[PDB]
Amino acid sequence: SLNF
Amino acid sequence: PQITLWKRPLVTIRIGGQLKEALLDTGADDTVLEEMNLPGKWKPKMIGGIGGFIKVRQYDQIPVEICGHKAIGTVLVGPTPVNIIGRNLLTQIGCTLNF
Amino acid sequence: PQITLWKRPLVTIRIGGQLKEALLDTGADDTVLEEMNLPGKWKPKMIGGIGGFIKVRQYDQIPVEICGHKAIGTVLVGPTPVNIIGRNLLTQIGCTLNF
C-alpha cells in the first residue's frame, strides 16, 4: 500500500 | 486519450457528485483523496508514501468517473498533498503506460 | 512497450554503470533514486508527498537508460524505498499514458  | 507527461497528468474526476482534479499516478497502489465527506461506512487504514505512513479512511465500492470513464473501487481519504488516482482505478479504465 | 498496471510498473534502468529496478511513476515530477554514491556536484533539496518530506541530494545531467532508451537529467538521491522514474525522464523516452 505504497503511494509515490 | 493519450496523455503526455510534460505537464503533471491532472484529470477531472467526479466523486460523490463533486468534481475534483486528481493526478493520474502509476506510482500509487491506491487512490487517495483529500479529506472530504463521503457516504458509507469507512474503515481506518494506514498507507505509505515518500515521506512515511499516514492513516486514511477507506471507503469501498465508490463510483468515480475519471475523464468520463467509470470506475467503482476503493477510495482512501486522508492528508495527501494532492488527489491521486492510483493503479486500483487506472486498471479499471484500461489505462496503460506506453513508450 | 505497453505496460499494464495490474502490478507496479517496475522496469530495469542503468545509472552510473549499475542496473537497477525502478518504478515508472507519472505522479513523480522528478526522479529519485535510492541512496547511491554518485560522482558529481550536488545540491540539498527537500521533496515531499504522502507522509511528509525527505531530504535528497540533487545531481544534474546524469545519463540513465530506461529499458534501453537513453535519457539524461536531474536525479535526486535520498532514502526512498523504491527508485522512482519521474516525469523529467519519462518525457525523454516518449512515455505516454493511454486509455
Spatial separation of the terminal alpha carbons of chain A: 10 Å
Cα shape of chain B: globular
CATH architecture identity of chain B: Beta Barrel
Strand content of chain B: over 45%
Using DSSP, what is the number of strands of chain B?
9
How many beta-strand segments of chain A?
Answer: 0
Subunit structure (chains B, C): Homodimer, whose active site consists of two apposed aspartic acid residues.
Active site (chains B, C): 25 (for protease activity)
Region (Dimerization of protease) (chains B, C): 1-5, 49-55, 88-99
Domain Peptidase A2 (chains B, C): 20-89
Short description:
The complex is a heterotrimer, with one copy of chain A (4 residues) and two copies of chain B (99 residues). Chain A is low in regular secondary structure.
Structural features, described:
Chains B, C: Residues 1-5, 49-55, 88-99 are annotated as: Dimerization of protease. Chains B, C: Residues 20-89 form the Peptidase A2 domain. Chains B, C: This is Protease. The complex is a heterotrimer, with one copy of chain A (4 residues) and two copies of chain B (99 residues). The N and C termini of chain A lie close together (10 Å). Chain A is largely without helices or strands. Chain B is mainly beta and 99 residues long. In chain B, strands 2, 3, 4, 5, 6, 7 and 8 form a seven-stranded mixed beta sheet that branches. In chain B, strand 5 and strand 6 (52-66) form a beta hairpin. The two termini of chain B are 15 Å apart. At the B-C interface, strand 1, strand 5, strand 6 and strand 9 of B face strand 1, strand 5, strand 6 and strand 9 of C.
Helices and strands in order:
The complex is a heterotrimer, with one copy of chain A (4 residues) and two copies of chain B (99 residues).
Chain A: no helix or strand
Chain B: E1 2-4, E2 10-15, E3 18-24, E4 32-33, E5 43-49, E6 52-66, E7 69-77, E8 84-85, H1 87-90, E9 96-98
